[PDB]
Design a protein around this ligand. Structure first.
Ligand code: HEM
Ligand code: HEM
Ligand SMILES: Cc1cc(N)nc(CCc2cc(F)cc(CC[C@H]3CCCN3)c2)c1
Ligand SMILES: Cc1cc(N)nc(CCc2cc(F)cc(CC[C@H]3CCCN3)c2)c1
Ligand SMILES: C[C@H](O)[C@H](O)[C@H]1CNc2nc(N)[nH]c(=O)c2N1
Ligand SMILES: C[C@H](O)[C@H](O)[C@H]1CNc2nc(N)[nH]c(=O)c2N1
Ligand SMILES: [Zn+2]
Lengths: 410, 411
């Protein structure tokens, strides 16, 4: 019940007690592990006050005021507001703590060593999609910081009755369009084909190129969503070239510098923030392995191997593997040259081992999802591969939520 | 109740009902997942239900459930258990069991081949010398001059746990590892502890970098005994690279036959504690893990040096570059010497076809994503995008403690 995790490369063993504070469910039972399922599955007055109590108790513990007058006063004050209003509002300081700890608790995130440096933008006074646009532009500019990227989150008003939801319909703030063609192939980003539809199909005018930055589709107070173009001077992009292959630039590849997830739900103290775009900086493999080389994405392996004149006849020449490394060398090379923050998978996983060490030492544990923490290339030459991890669900947390166009009473 | 898995690269969705036949625990609970944990004495009381469960499965597979053959065999096993406290499997049952143990092995990517297992019944063996003879014949049959054939040899089952047969080697064929006084390691670092036992038991170590370890064999709970596998039975492959001529000068070689020998085979409640089994290698087991793991031969540095790579910052991906070349060399050397090997792209594609077939004709296929996904180039293989359900079916292969920790020495 006071569990242990072993690293098999170093024999270091850690003792996890934090899992005893777990609350939500994992989807596993003692008969079947769902550790590899991508995503398994209104608040009443009754369920809401225990959730607030749990949160405020850990908040006042972290500031070393558990069982103080200020604690009990805040407890009763929120208690009163719930009995009256059927919800409540977080103090700024509780909002920042809640956001930083949703990141800290995100078991699938390898970049958490930076969790405590998050920049939190309170947008709870926003009322309109134009206002949402303004807040999001300010976020993008601050986080991008001319290439010296800084982590940030912007938090729009919390859900009330589910009829007045604030939603960013983009899955990320910055993403490239994707169009089906007569040919039957797909131009641009295939993962964005449906959304690139629902933009044009909502009023957008597509340049129909390969790397067209999608417009924002912003929904305030449950109204119809509105299109907005992010000023190009705010969207930092990196042309992609190889440090050794001059034909690489002729591939005509580029990627954007800012990864900004915008479709998740932030839960703090029982309250639900359905619009909470957050951003950090890329790990190189997200672009080079996944975005470029997934079959259901840009899928450039064949063209790159062709240009390398590799023996593509049999899989045992490891030509996909060989191209894959070169592509990822280039992505890192391009970002570093243009002075835009990026981390390689060796540094990020080494950082995460250090972070686990600190969490076990000063917190008693660190929830972690091996299936997602281990990079999608060169898995076993990174230290996380040999690291046992326990996965459990803490709160505050980021959660998945249904796509809006399926839900909006249009 | 039914359960769905989705392939996120092809949107193929499958429905698992087989998990309803699940017995043993996983280690997971509703509030914690132990999915990445490497490792999560039996009386007549619980034995006949385990036997009955197994025989019901056996007779369903041969389309004879409820037959008089089925009912008499149940009765016969029943009386043998109450009279003798254990029971014996028929030959047919033992073959069925070992095949299905492999079929149920949720961490094995190679399971498309499960129906083609050669089973050697060694239940009449009684001494370590008899064990040595059976294992030699397995190695000769399985190697087949490089045209490898899957096989398993099954020594007598446990009785009171004080008369166990055990193969003390973790694998039938492995290289020695020697710790030097200066702290460095010669050979395979993973085998230092076992090599020391062998030397303590009287093995004369040649102390090279690729010395095949002796077999240490324990019969009927007696002290184990040393034997040297005849070298002409140990097929080995010099590692060269198809473009780099300097690669041969690294002096690398590997044996051809992967043969796991320290696991426990469970069939109908009977425990077979010595059950060596062998197949053929996936390239990455040698090229990624054996050679490049930091706690193994760890040749990335030497290979990166000779490739003249930017080794100053990790972001040059010099490690990933050297790893790919080492894995091309392993595949090229094996193919050139006509020793059966499979690359990780071929092996994962086959397992996806196997898994889909299993869902259709069996109702599911238990699978451990953490172990199925290869240790390099994960997401460019199709298993990476495949959701999988992990649960334990029997017959099964289980882990057991190392014998030198539990053995009572005679002298
Ligand atoms: C600062 C550098 C960061 C790096 C290098 C990083 C890296 C990653 C990576 C590689 C993933 C895997 C997901 C995928 O492959 O698509 C991930 C997931 C995730 N990240 Fe981080 N991230 C960073 C910042 C942040 C920040 C600032 C937040 C929130 C404030 C965050 C929250 C999350 C969450 C919630 C998930 C997983 C969502 C899920 O459950 O599926 N990350 N991250
Ligand atoms: C014939 C070709 C085969 C291939 C290519 C293959 C490949 C693999 C691989 C790569 C693993 C992962 C283990 C690791 O990386 O250390 C594995 C695990 C396993 N294999 Fe197969 N295997 C084959 C045949 C067999 C046979 C013949 C058996 C038994 C009759 C078997 C039973 C198992 C079991 C029980 C495991 C689980 C290991 C554990 O839990 O530690 N495999 N296999
Ligand atoms: C802030 C940040 C930094 C970084 N370095 N990277 C990302 C993107 C990784 C990510 C995080 C999430 F919270 C959710 C997703 C999408 C989840 C599913 C949908 C499609 C495939 N993955 C992705 C975000
Ligand atoms: C038949 C076979 C075929 C193949 N192609 N390969 C193997 C070796 C894979 C394997 C299987 C096992 F049943 C157990 C192990 C070792 C277990 C743990 C101990 C430390 C790290 N691995 C390895 C076996
Ligand atoms: C801690 C972790 O479970 C451990 O490193 C596992 C991960 N996956 C693996 N997968 C395979 N095929 N072989 C292994 O030895 C391991 N080791
Ligand atoms: C089915 C499987 O869960 C799916 O492919 C997962 C595996 N691991 C992953 N790991 C990361 N970091 N990102 C992903 O999108 C996925 N996808
Ligand atoms: Zn689990």
């Amino acid at each position: 019940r006071f569990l242990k995790v072993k690293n098999w490369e170093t024999d270091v063993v850690l003792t996890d007690t934090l899992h005893l504070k777990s609350t939500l469910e994992t989807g596993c039972t003692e008969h079947i592990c769902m550790g590899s399922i991508m995503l398994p599955s209104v608040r009443t007055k009754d369920q809401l006050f225990p959730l607030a109590k749990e949160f405020l108790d850990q908040y006042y513990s972290s500031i070393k005021r558990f069982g103080s007058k200020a604690h009990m006063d805040r407890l009763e004050e929120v208690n009163k507001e719930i009995e009256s209003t059927s919800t409540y509002q977080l103090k700024d300081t509780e909002l920042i703590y809640g956001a930083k700890h949703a990141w800290r608790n995100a078991s699938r995130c390898v970049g958490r060593i930076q969790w405590s440096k998050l920049q939190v933008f309170d947008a709870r006074d926003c009322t309109t999609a134009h206002g949402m646009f303004n807040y999001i532009c300010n976020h993008v500019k601050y986080a991008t910081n001319k290439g010296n990227l800084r982590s940030a989150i912007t938090i729009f008003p919390q859900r009330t009755d589910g009829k007045h939801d604030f939603r960013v319909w983009n899955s990320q703030l910055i993403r490239y369009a994707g169009y089906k063609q007569p040919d039957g192939s797909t131009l641009g980003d295939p993962a964005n084909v449906q959304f690139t539809e629902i933009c044009i199909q909502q009023g957008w005018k597509a340049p129909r190129g390969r790397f067209d930055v999608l417009p924002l589709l912003l929904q305030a107070n449950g109204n119809d969503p509105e299109l907005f173009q992010i000023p190009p001077e705010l969207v930092l992009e990196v042309p992609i070239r190889h440090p050794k292959f001059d034909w690489f630039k002729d591939l005509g590849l580029k990627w954007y510098g800012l990864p900004a997830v915008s479709n998740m739900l932030l839960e703090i103290g029982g309250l639900e923030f359905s619009a909470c775009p957050f951003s950090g900086w890329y790990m190189g493999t997200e672009i080079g392995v996944r975005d470029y080389c997934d079959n259901s994405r840009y899928n450039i392996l064949e063209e790159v191997a062709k240009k390398m004149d590799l023996d593509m006849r049999k899989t045992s020449s490891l030509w996909k593997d060989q191209a894959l490394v070169e592509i990822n060398i280039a992505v890192l090379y391009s970002f570093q040259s243009d002075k835009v923050t990026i981390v390689d998978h060796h540094s990020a996983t080494e950082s995460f081992i250090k972070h686990m060490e600190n969490e076990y030492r000063c917190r008693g544990g660190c929830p972690a999802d091996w299936v997602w923490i281990v990079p999608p290339m060169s898995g076993s030459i990174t230290p996380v591969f040999h690291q046992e991890m326990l996965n459990y669900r803490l709160t505050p947390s980021f959660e998945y939520q249904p796509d809006p166009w399926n839900t909006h009473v249009w």
